[PDB]
Amino acid sequence: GHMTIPGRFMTIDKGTFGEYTASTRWPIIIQNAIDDLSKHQETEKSNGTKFEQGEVIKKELKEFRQEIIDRVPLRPFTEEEIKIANVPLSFNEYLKKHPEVNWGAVEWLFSEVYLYRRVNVLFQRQCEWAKFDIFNRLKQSTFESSFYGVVELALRYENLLPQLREMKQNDDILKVLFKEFIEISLWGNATDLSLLTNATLEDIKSIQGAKARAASESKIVVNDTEKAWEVLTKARADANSREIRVDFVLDNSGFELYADLMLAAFLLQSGLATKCIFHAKDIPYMVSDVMLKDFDILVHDLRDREFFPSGEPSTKESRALDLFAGEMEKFVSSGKIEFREDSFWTTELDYWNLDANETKYHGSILHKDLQKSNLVIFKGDLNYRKLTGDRKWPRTTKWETAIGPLATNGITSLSLRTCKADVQVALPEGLDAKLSQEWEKENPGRGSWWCCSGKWAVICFCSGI
Numbered sequence: 052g053h054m055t056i057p058g059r060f061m062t063i064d065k066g067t068f069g070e071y072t073a074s075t076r077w078p079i080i081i082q083n084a085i086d087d088l089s090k091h092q093e094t095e096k097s098n099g100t101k102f103e104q105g106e107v108i109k110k111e112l113k114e115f116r117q118e119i120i121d122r123v124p125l126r127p128f129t130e131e132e133i134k135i136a137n138v139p140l141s142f143n144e145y146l147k148k149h150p151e152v153n154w155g156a157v158e159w160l161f162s163e164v165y166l167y168r169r170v171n172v173l174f175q176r177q178c179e180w181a182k183f184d185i186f187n188r189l190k191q192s193t194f195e196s197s198f199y200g201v202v203e204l205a206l207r208y209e210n211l212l213p214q215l216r217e218m219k220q221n222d223d224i225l226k227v228l229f230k231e232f233i234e235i236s237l238w239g240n241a242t243d244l245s246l247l248t249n250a251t252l253e254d255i256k257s258i259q260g261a262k263a264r265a266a267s268e269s270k271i272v273v274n275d276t277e278k279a280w281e282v283l284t285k286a287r288a289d290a291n292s293r294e295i296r297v298d299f300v301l302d303n304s305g306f307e308l309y310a311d312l313m314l315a316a317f318l319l320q321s322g323l324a325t326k327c328i329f330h331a332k333d334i335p336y337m338v339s340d341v342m343l344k345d346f347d348i349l350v351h352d353l354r355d356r357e358f359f360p361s362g363e364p365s366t367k368e369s370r371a372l373d374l375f376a377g378e379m380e381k382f383v384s385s386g387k388i389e390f391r392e393d394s395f396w397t398t399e400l401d402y403w404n405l406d407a408n409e410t411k412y413h414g415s416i417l418h419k420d421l422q423k424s425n426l427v428i429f430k431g432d433l434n435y436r437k438l439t440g441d442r443k444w445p446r447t448t449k450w451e452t453a454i455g456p457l458a459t460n461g462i463t464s465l466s467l468r469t470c471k472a473d474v475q476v477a478l479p480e481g482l483d484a485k486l487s488q489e490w491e492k493e494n495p496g497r498g499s500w501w502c503c504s505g506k507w508a509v510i511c512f513c514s515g516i
């Protein structure tokens with residue numbers, strides 16, 4: 052909040068995608084939760100404590116949706132709620148500093164995080180529902196529909212595995228693979244089959260492979276992939292220190308999580324990493340965002356021949372899915388892959404609080420540990436919003452400026468972000484004008500929303516020094 056620090060995007064900022072999100076998408080998400088709760092009830096006993104508790108949650112969700120529609124003031128969490136649902140104290144502190152804010156004129160970042168907190172308090176109050184994930188039906192459904200791409204990537208892992216081992220025993224072929232797995236991780240479900248369909252080293256190196264990468268990369272308007280490459284290849288070559296730690300601050304479950312696992316597996320098998328740590332959400336959050344249990348659901352899905360019908364176990368497809376699931380379990384057992392959750396990730400705090408200054412809500416604890424990482428990969432749009440504080444930076448703002456203390460407090464970071472929100476920085480001169488003018492043609496009055504569409508992406512690096 053300094054003189055030259057821009058304000059955060061607000062639900063009241065006229066013509067922004069945040070304004071549209073709050074007035075239009077949020078009541079849909081809550082209504083979807085009511086409907087999914089109804090769908091779940093179909094599959095169980097129609098009376099008793101669990102049933103009644105769920106009817107009450109549905110009523111409360113209905114009223115909550117209407118509160119957002121009526122643009123009422125955001126109420127604090129009661130002491131009872133804080134204790135039963137383990138609500139961080141940060142929310143009530145925020146509301147004291149922002150008295151009487153209402154859904155119609157409130158910071159987009161805080162209110163969105165608050166939304167999922169209010170939803171979770173309803174579930175945590177109800178003992179038969181305290182661990183239920185109201186977004187899980189959707190998470191599973193979306194992943195189920197990714198069958199084709201899932202099998203293609205599993206086949207690729209299995210194919211590459213001997214060559215990755217030889218690489219580890221020693222390449223610009225390794226560089227091509229690095230770009231592929233980074234970009235597949237970046238695009239998540241949106242990954243075009245053109246990238247995935249090349250499942251052998253030969254196909255990846257081929258003209259077809261090159262064209263697929265060039266198509267992906269033409270949409271990545273800031274691309275610091277080479278800087279991260281630099282970091283991991285130098286650490287691998289460094290014979291003084293052996294540990295190479297890579298962290299993943301995660302976004303969505305399912306295919307995006309699968310691709311992050313695939314990137315981790317690739318780094319581990321090639322020697323570009325020796326330990327990968329995954330950071331997940333501790334409550335159902337932003338609809339699809341990974342929780343610890345979503346990893347185990349993914350591994351179970353991979354082996355589930357009703358879920359992913361890869362045919363008899365003997366098929367190549369079934370063998371490849373089973374191999375990857377087994378590799379995951381193996382890496383978790385040996386500690387090459389480790390999953391963690393933390394309440395910090397589901398507070399309203401932006402990542403300028405990933406700093407020694409943040410002594411109340413774990414920011415300083417996480418920061419001290421992340422300093423030890425060779426590379427912290429932040430996935431997705433929400434993490435990017437928290438890196439940049441979700442502020443109205445000019446769209447050419449230097450990346451180091453937008454991330455505040457993260458430019459200088461010893462965390463080496465890489466943001467992989469599909470652009471799905473108004474905030475956008477580090478663009479070349481003139482690019483925002485160019486993309487806006489093209490976008491404006493089919494989206495009148497909304498030219499600036501090119502970076503809200505998910506069609507463009509950025510890959511942004513900072514050494515933290």
Ligand SMILES: [Mg+2]
Pocket residue numbers: 302303337339340431433
């Ligand atoms: Mg997400």
